[PDB]
Design an enzyme around this catalytic site. Sequence first.
Site, short mmCIF file in Angstrom:
data_model
loop_
_atom_site.label_atom_id
_atom_site.label_comp_id
_atom_site.label_asym_id
_atom_site.label_seq_id
_atom_site.Cartn_x
_atom_site.Cartn_y
_atom_site.Cartn_z
N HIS A 53 33.76 83.43 7.98
CA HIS A 53 33.83 82.50 6.85
C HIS A 53 34.98 81.48 6.85
CE1 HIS A 53 30.52 84.59 5.34
NE2 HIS A 53 31.17 85.56 4.66
N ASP A 81 22.24 92.94 6.29
CA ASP A 81 23.39 92.08 6.54
C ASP A 81 22.98 91.26 7.71
OD1 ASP A 81 25.91 90.92 6.48
OD2 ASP A 81 26.99 92.82 6.82
N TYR A 110 26.14 86.45 -5.49
CA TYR A 110 25.44 87.73 -5.37
C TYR A 110 24.59 87.93 -6.64
CZ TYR A 110 28.77 89.98 -1.94
OH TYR A 110 29.52 90.36 -0.82
N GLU A 141 22.29 83.56 1.42
CA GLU A 141 23.09 82.48 1.96
C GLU A 141 22.27 81.54 2.79
OE1 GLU A 141 26.85 84.44 3.52
OE2 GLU A 141 25.81 86.03 2.39
N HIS A 171 28.01 81.76 -1.64
CA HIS A 171 28.05 83.22 -1.60
C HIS A 171 27.75 83.96 -2.91
CE1 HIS A 171 29.18 87.13 0.18
NE2 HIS A 171 29.30 86.55 1.38
O1 LIG Z 1 27.80 89.35 5.93
C1 LIG Z 1 29.07 89.52 5.28
C2 LIG Z 1 29.41 90.99 5.15
O2 LIG Z 1 29.29 91.66 6.40
C3 LIG Z 1 30.77 91.20 4.46
O3 LIG Z 1 31.86 90.86 5.33
O4 LIG Z 1 30.84 90.41 3.24
C4 LIG Z 1 30.45 89.01 3.35
C5 LIG Z 1 29.04 88.93 3.88
O5 LIG Z 1 28.55 87.60 3.75
#
Ligand SMILES: O[C@@H]1[C@@H](O)[C@@H](O)OC[C@H]1O
Lengths: 339, 346
Positions: free
Chosen positions: A95, A242, A171, A303, A169
């Site tokens: 990120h 993920d 949720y 995302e 990001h």
């Molecule tokens: O994929 C990522 C996950 O593995 C964690 O690090 O939190 C952020 C998410 O976007």
Amino acid sequence: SIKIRDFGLGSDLISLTNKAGVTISFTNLGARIVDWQKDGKHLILGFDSAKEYLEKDAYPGATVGPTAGRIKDGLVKISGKDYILNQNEGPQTLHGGEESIHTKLWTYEVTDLGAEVQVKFSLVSNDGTNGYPGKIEMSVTHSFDDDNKWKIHYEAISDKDTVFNPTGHVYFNLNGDASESVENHGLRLAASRFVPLKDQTEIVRGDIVDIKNTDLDFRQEKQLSNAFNSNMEQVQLVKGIDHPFLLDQLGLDKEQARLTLDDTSISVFTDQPSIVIFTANFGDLGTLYHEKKQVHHGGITFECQVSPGSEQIPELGDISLKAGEKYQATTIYSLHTKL
Amino acid sequence: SIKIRDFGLGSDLISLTNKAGVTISFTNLGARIVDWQKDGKHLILGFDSAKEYLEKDAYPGATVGPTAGRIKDGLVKISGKDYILNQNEGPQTLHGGEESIHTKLWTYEVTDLGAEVQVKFSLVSNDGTNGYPGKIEMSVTHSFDDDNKWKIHYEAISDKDTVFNPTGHVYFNLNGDASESVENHGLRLAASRFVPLKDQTEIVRGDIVDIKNTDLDFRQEKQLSNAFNSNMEQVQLVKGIDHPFLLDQLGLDKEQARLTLDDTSISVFTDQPSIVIFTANFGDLGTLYHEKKQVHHGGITFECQVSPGSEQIPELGDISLKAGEKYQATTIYSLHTKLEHHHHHH
Ligand SMILES: O[C@@H]1[C@@H](O)[C@@H](O)OC[C@H]1O
Ligand SMILES: O[C@@H]1[C@@H](O)[C@@H](O)OC[C@H]1O
Ligand code: NI
């Protein structure tokens, strides 16, 4: 109506209530969404003050970038040249590196268009910041309308060839409570392939896999519990989801995904080619949201961006941004209530 | 009393009033002072909203860095290594480069100590920003107390060996009106030497010159017009003052400079070795401050820091910051009334 208030640490909270009485709020700290509510219920995860985000978890609701996701060894090639980015998760660049754009206070201007209200956030990423060539002038416009459409529009211009692929990001948790698993929501996703991870470092494995007819095929609406109860090694690896999903058909006009719980549903539209889904696989962490301890699977992201891993799998796409070129992206979250 | 309100573009305005009724204001945009008033009169230059700063001039009252001043060719040597920094003034790096710290929104927290109020602003300069090794965690605390002391305390810690030498870019104007020149002010400054500039580009010449008994000698108070009217080569070069002055005696305890107009004086204290002075040699630019067209010589700075040019004149000092070392600097501007007799005319 519009309401602006001090959100702590010099940040602002901008809250918009449309004609339908729906409330969505944002903060300049990370050009981020903080809350989205209907009839007193929160549809998404968020904190109550700026400090919370800096102490608990800075990602929720934020604009992350310049490049969203993990970059293996923090290595990107630009105009044939190798560039090493800030490494903040072992050798990877996650990120955009440490103290990235989601932790900065962006400037902003509010534009009231009546049926629609826009909040345009801006930030300049200096040339060399966390290893990225620049300067990159960026803006993220969050908008909300009387149709319950929350839109995100990105724009960037760089003084030098660089890389750029940000994302939002947020949720979601239609349960309106973090102590409650999203395993009860139903998900529909218009993607037939996904990108598997190499291992626990979460870097891409190298290949693209067909998911048709597997626990991860949501081409036809299904309850998340399925995926969650799956024994596919990929699910087992991360304890949930993920991963990047490759959309079958591109274009802003198609509903690419839909999250549903009872009478309430959220549709996702984007001009992006992929959707990276994370199901808050935190186990016992227990991050507190509004006094409620979060549960493993207590949230889900959507995302929208170019898939991570293009560095190893070029077919995924190309995130380069050439000097002088204008980058643009649009992602839409639409709220619907069954009558 | 402490008061807060939005100041534009997302920034805040922090306004303090001390027990003596003196007010001072700051903004998180550039950890900057916006105003300081005594009995309704502006003691400094400032604007009325954040946009004005971004559109007119972003320097006034700002915290500037990571390195204040001009670095010839943007070149610095760090732990045996040459680093090129962002060049924003021809091949020069001026005030940390483009879109630097003075243009960012810093986060902040206020601490009320009663007789003193502290406003601590924080910002992280990511590693490689504008070419600077880092990351650098910086904080600037502006404080104002019941004794009319406005103090600036800087703190910084880097993850990597880098360079660090910021300053505060406030401009004073005791006339309380930008359209009036500070030539009518009296200046006392405890400095026997100065650093001449090579030319119009404004990089340092290379030498240190003694200014005792010249139009630039202010050891004993004198009107500023004496400098402005001077035809010394250095004065004509820049049309006023725009140079570093080396303090003769170092230490926070010593009153290094004093700016007076009638019954009001501003005293300057610092733990730094020099004071960079710029007298707003803008000519006919006419920037508008509170609807008044600023005049040439319509303001004066006292930028306390290590003198620019150390790259070429090692005698000036060393602005390196070793990784893990905590940097600190303190500068104080104090307000006094009837400190001395200053009754003149122009
Ligand atoms: O994929 C990522 C996950 O593995 C964690 O690090 O939190 C952020 C998410 O976007
Ligand atoms: O010394 C500088 C001056 O020469 C100009 O660039 O304005 C800002 C001052 O700090
Ligand atoms: Ni505010």
